[PDB]
Design a binder for this molecule. Structure first.
Ligand code: SAH
Length: 263
């Protein structure tokens, strides 16, 4: 585990979290508790989910100085977040859990998250439509939240040192912006189309038709009829997957869902 030892980056993450004494913060991972302490100082209360019980000495020492820290010993991928009341998440994430934890947190919901990722992962998260790092992860995150890189973090900020850069990413959930009709279908639709990101949406959906539980002949006919509903759909499905904006992907999947339900 690479612990964050540079207080300048701790400060940047905390400042970006815009904390007040009315905020309740969830932290994933304790480390030496350098971030934990700053959260404790500034927030109403901090929950720390930590998998490694050997780190108890840091926890015990922290509770002697701060009365508003609660440790939950366990695996953050296993813990039922629904049973916790918090409005913000601030963490130097274990990079191996980056993807599942991000969606688990977004599913649970929060006002704002400020999270450390590997830099490449963060770049994919915030990638603009039609660019080389734009992909399924970009759309899955941006369709549900506004995301931005707050700072690039060098290996020297950590001990022991990682091999690559990290990034602080700010996440502000945004349900209204795009409005996903059906979460399950949208997830299936995203999987199908980004299995073939350089192909047209049409050709991607035919190739990955089994991801939506249709055979290739059914899907081809479906899209013939779907294309006949309006000219906007025609232009969208003929375009390359990675070139569609998040807005257009959400709208397209919404319309396709409705089309399929009526069929
Ligand atoms: N699945 C998991 N659930 C909860 N904690 C985990 C975890 N996997 C790793 N951890 C813990 O998360 C921490 C990651 S290193 C980050 C430590 C600290 N936040 C800092 O900035 O220095 C370690 O304490 C490690 O034991």
């Amino acid at each position: 585990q690479c612990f964050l030892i540079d207080k300048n980056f701790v400060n940047k993450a905390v400042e970006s979290a815009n904390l007040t004494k009315d905020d309740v913060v969830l932290e994933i991972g304790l480390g030496k508790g350098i971030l934990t302490e700053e959260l404790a100082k500034n927030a109403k209360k901090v929950y720390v989910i930590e998998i490694d019980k050997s780190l108890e000495p840091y926890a015990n020492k922290l509770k002697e100085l701060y009365n508003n820290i609660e440790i939950i010993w366990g695996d953050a991928l296993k813990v039922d977040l629904n049973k916790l009341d918090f409005n913000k998440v601030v963490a130097n994430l274990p990079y191996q859990i980056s993807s599942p934890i991000t969606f688990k947190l977004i599913k649970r919901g929060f006002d704002l998250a400020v999270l450390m990722y590997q830099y490449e992962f963060a770049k994919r998260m915030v990638a603009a439509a039609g660019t080389k790092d734009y992909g399924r992860l970009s759309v899955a995150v941006q369709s549900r939240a506004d995301v931005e890189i707050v700072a690039k973090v060098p290996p020297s900020a950590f001990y022991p040192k990682p091999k690559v850069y990290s990034a602080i990413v700010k996440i502000k959930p945004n349900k209204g912006k795009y409005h996903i009709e059906n979460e399950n279908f949208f997830d299936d639709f995203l999987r199908a189309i980004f299995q073939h990101r350089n192909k047209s949406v049409r050709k991607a959906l035919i190739d990955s038709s089994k991801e939506l539980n249709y055979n290739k002949d059914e899907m081809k006919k479906i899209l013939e009829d779907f294309l006949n509903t309006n000219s906007e759909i025609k232009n969208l499905i003929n375009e390359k997957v990675f070139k569609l904006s998040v807005k257009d992907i959400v709208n397209l999947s919404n319309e396709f869902y409705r089309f399929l339900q009526n069929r």
